[PDB]
Design a protein around this ligand. Structure first.
Ligand code: FAD
Ligand code: FAD
Ligand code: 5IK
Ligand code: 5IK
Ligand code: C15
Ligand code: C15
Lengths: 494, 499
């Protein structure tokens, strides 16, 4: 019935918001559509896997809010295995390498590849994190897909395939589907190409012991009966003195304020009175989520480490179901496993198959990439197709098609009367990640503390001290990386 | 509570479906979200306008189903005024012309222009109406925006600017927003470039006496109390023997089948049990509608006719609020009016102005374009911003961004258990129009008649006799239009001849 704030959605963002309001002395209710909390994080437990992250999993340096929240809740991290060599599989062959991205040996291709990622970072430096529509070339860049940008920029097929794989892996969408402006903002607001792609010293450095689902679960433990499971919100009425929020199971919640902590497009599942203003009414029809099946094959031992492979595979080409993998073995060396993503159009394609059919295809691919018959002998398999989730819409995050971010992007976090907007999509650092979810939940919470007169405006956005446990090292470039010419640049000099 | 078929949506599609099902003996209920039927058609009546269409309005040759439905309901059509000259306004100057598109005198530009719409129609013939994703180059065309297609095809800026305006007018979206495959399909399934753009012998030839809103209102008259206004559907449960459909005002309806006759993305407003299959689940987050404000400025007299202007203006330029107008004078010659569209990014930009400020900007534009100070003397104004409609999502219709139609297109009208899909977006001919609404509504109803064993499979898709009142002149080309080279084709002829 009555409270101070109703939070819609019990993902990390909603939970982080609810925890902050609760800790400040307000009465909060969290309305969650599903029979669980965690949303796009989900940790499955059984005896075969012990625990496995089937959704969001990795955290790394510069993600200081999720690390502080998780540490307070009593969680600890361990490092993803990256002691041995990475593998780039291209044109049916495996090339082992060390470092964040595969070395290029052909000198023309080297120039072209080097220029491409240098250029993504250069372009990013002109895009404000909190307002990408204010980039000097915002409209130009927003009216191009990433496919067009890559066709203009890449002179070699081989750099273009690498760059395409990069886009597919970062945002689980095809290059032709996404705005260039949006994608370039996305990379930049994670701290750039190196930081976004890297395990060591990057976004995939670490996992939580026991799974990331414990973040949402432990906050639920704190809030007790204030969290209502299987309460999908259908109706929010703001015509009266207090805000009225109705659920599908026929309950009514009354509050001074609401935090919407759901993906923007899932706003469509709610009937509003009065209707939303025009820009938000259209925006929420224009912002899909990507497509991904997360797949984990278990083995008796981490047999790849014997061949001096870490388990990371970057896999080129149309025929491979999986483009990217990481070692998902536990810290102790047991429950050996490879984690792989079936991305974008391959997710639509292979979802038709049975679970056993997908396992066979993955095992045969890994046998080829890792060069071991051991890969043909899985002891267990887990997978989740996030495309089929009614209350997520896909994974990892919301992508913006061409034209949308400049026309509608301004309204993402704009309050609608007494509704404030959270969700990772509204963050300005690591938006799309669990880190963004924390930033956005806590920021929306503090917007409401400010509307209530409890805090000054300058405390709505709060900086975060660096994690002592997971410090950031500088991102560096070499002299040659910075000043080698592009392919057209070399041509002009001839 | 109990019936044979619940129809969700009381637009033309829903009402056509419900009418067919009722006439064949079944017990139907229509659940409509709004306090009125008609959806994206809406006829306003007051003493200043008598009546005016603020949404869907025009019908034309080849739209035989809406013409038949309208005629059986006791409606009549009249011709939109195209007696005098059209105007093309570009770079601040007005160029009167006759015929469907502004003729191009600069020969190079002529070749480029000619080639552009010829290539639109050529590519269109590659694309099956009922399965655009089966075109031989479906993938390549779908992975491209219309902006990229026009940048490759137009060797002159003037052709490119005309092509851009064509896309904005047809689908109320920017060239960079829409899939090339989708747009080429959309045009082809309307009968091609000429048919879609034309007043005489095209989509905009006629209007209903009294407004298009009467189609929905008259079917509601025939169905009586079976139509339920202010029943937004929130929940559809298919787990039991009978389908359960729940509304926001707390009513439960129980049926054998459901027709969903709402724009695909407004399917998001419904919670499904069991959950939708993956492909539909994602598809309905990927298919927005366009952006338009429809504006009608009333004048003492249709003063433009006296200058030998019919009232049609094709207006190119960033400063121009309105890109296209038609004469909206009553057939009796009174309530003189100009109907205009504010399209795509201009809808967004100008929505933040007041009604009075928008009227002012339109008048100043019309005055310049028509060369007439009388345009600054309006007697009345009406407008409707469709972008602000919770239960439409925009107008005229749904567009597909790059990559969506090939990946998700095949599930648009794929039934989900005992839910069948209508709405104009699921039609194969004049999808996006009132015609497509009628086609899709009647087809979905007949899918259900087949499921119930009342008709054979070959009667689901039914052809439509040609209107005797609105006969279709065929679309013809001249020899020169068919065989004149493109710009790069001419350049090839030049390089070859000089060797
Ligand atoms: C799915 C996924 C995500 C993911 C990733 C891999 C996959 C396969 N890998 C990641 C990673 O390694 N590291 C990382 O930091 N993030 C990763 N991601 C993304 C990450 O999981 C997400 O950014 C994050 O979990 C998003 O959190 P947020 O709190 O913003 O959103 P959410 O989890 O979707 O929660 C929304 C909740 O709202 C409920 N809901 C939806 N509709 C309603 C209604 N109408 N009423 C009530 N509740 C509603 C949802 O059920 C959900 O719980
Ligand atoms: C908006 C517009 C449309 C239009 C046009 C100009 C404008 C500004 N010009 C046209 C023209 O000149 N000639 C023509 O043939 N078409 C033109 N268009 C398009 C035309 O209006 C539409 O194609 C057509 O009206 C679509 O009919 P359909 O029946 O397919 O779709 P609808 O009208 O949107 O009806 C949907 C109904 O469903 C209700 N609804 C929505 N959600 C719910 C829920 N959850 N529960 C119950 N009911 C729901 C809507 O309220 C609506 O009545
Ligand atoms: C193909 N690419 C080329 C390249 C790109 C940029 C700069 C230099 C070279 C190398 C590369 C290496 C590793 C990656 C991995 O990137 C990600 C990005 C986001 C995630 C996420 C998102 O949360 C989850 C995850 O499990 O793994 C990820 C992995 C991408 C691209
Ligand atoms: C700019 N263009 C150039 C061109 C386009 C194609 C072939 C040759 C030249 C000419 C032109 C002229 C008129 C039009 C008008 O097109 C439409 C399309 C759909 C509608 C619709 C859709 O319902 C409603 C309406 O009131 O007006 C429309 C008007 C478009 C294009
Ligand atoms: C050759 N490609 C790379 C196709 C285009 C160069 C682009 S550009 O000419 O530099 O615009
Ligand atoms: C050289 C001028 C390019 C002309 N445009 C029309 C810009 C591109 C032609 C593309 S294509 O070359 O026909 O593929």
């Amino acid at each position: 019935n009555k409270c101070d704030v109703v939070v819609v959605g019990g993902g990390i963002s909603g939970m982080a918001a609810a925890k902050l309001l609760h800790d400040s002395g307000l009465n909060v209710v969290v309305l969650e559509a599903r029979d669980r909390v965690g949303g796009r994080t989900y940790t499955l437990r059984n005896q075969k896997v012990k625990y496995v992250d089937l959704g969001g999993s990795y955290v790394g340096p510069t993600q200081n809010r999720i690390l502080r929240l998780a540490k307070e809740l009593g969680l600890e991290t361990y490092k993803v295995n990256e002691v041995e060599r990475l593998i780039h599989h291209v044109k049916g062959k495996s090339y082992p390498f060390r470092g964040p991205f595969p070395p290029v040996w052909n000198p023309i291709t080297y120039l072209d590849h080097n220029n491409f990622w240098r250029t993504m970072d250069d372009m990013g430096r002109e895009i404000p994190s909190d307002a990408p529509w204010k980039a000097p070339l915002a409209e130009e860049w927003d009216n191009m897909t990433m496919k067009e940008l890559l066709d203009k920029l890449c002179w070699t097929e081989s750099a273009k395939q690498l760059a395409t794989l990069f886009v597919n892996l970062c945002v689980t969408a095809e290059t032709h589907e996404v705005s260039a402006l949006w994608f370039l903002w996305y990379v930049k607001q994670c701290g750039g190409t190196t930081r976004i792609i890297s395990t060591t010293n990057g976004g995939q450095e670490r996992k939580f012991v026991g799974g990331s689902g414990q973040v949402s679960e432990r906050i639920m433990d704190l809030l007790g009966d204030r969290v209502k499971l299987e309460r999908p919100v259908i109706y929010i009425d703001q015509t009266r003195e207090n805000v009225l929020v109705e659920t599908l199971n026929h309950e009514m919640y009354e509050a001074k304020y609401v935090i919407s902590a759901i993906p923007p497009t899932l706003g469509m599942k709610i009937h509003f009175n009065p209707p939303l203003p025009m820009m938000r009414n259209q925006m929420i029809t224009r912002v899909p989520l990507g497509s991904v099946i997360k797949c984990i094959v278990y083995y008796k031992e981490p047999f790849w480490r014997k061949k001096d492979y870490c388990g990371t595979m970057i896999i080129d080409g149309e025929e491979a179901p999986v483009a990217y993998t990481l070692d998902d073995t536990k810290p102790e060396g047991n429950y050996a496993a490879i984690m792989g993503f079936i991305l974008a159009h391959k997710a639509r394609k292979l979802a038709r198959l049975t679970k056993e059919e997908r396992l066979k295809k993955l095992c045969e691919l890994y046998a080829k990439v890792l060069g071991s018959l051991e890969a043909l002998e899985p002891v267990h398999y887990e997978e989740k197709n996030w495309c089929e989730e009614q209350y997520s819409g896909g994974c990892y995050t919301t992508y913006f098609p061409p034209g949308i971010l400049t026309q509608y992007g301004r309204v993402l976090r704009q309050p609608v009367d007494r509704i404030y907007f959270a969700g990772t999509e509204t963050a300005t650092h690591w938006s799309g990640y669990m880190e963004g979810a924390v930033e956005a939940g806590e920021r929306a919470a503090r917007e409401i503390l400010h509307a209530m007169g409890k805090i000054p405006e300058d405390e709505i956005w709060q900086s975060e001290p660096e994690s002592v446990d997971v410090p950031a090292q500088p991102i560096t470039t070499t002299f040659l990386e910075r000043h080698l010419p592009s392919v057209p640049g070399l041509l002009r000099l001839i």
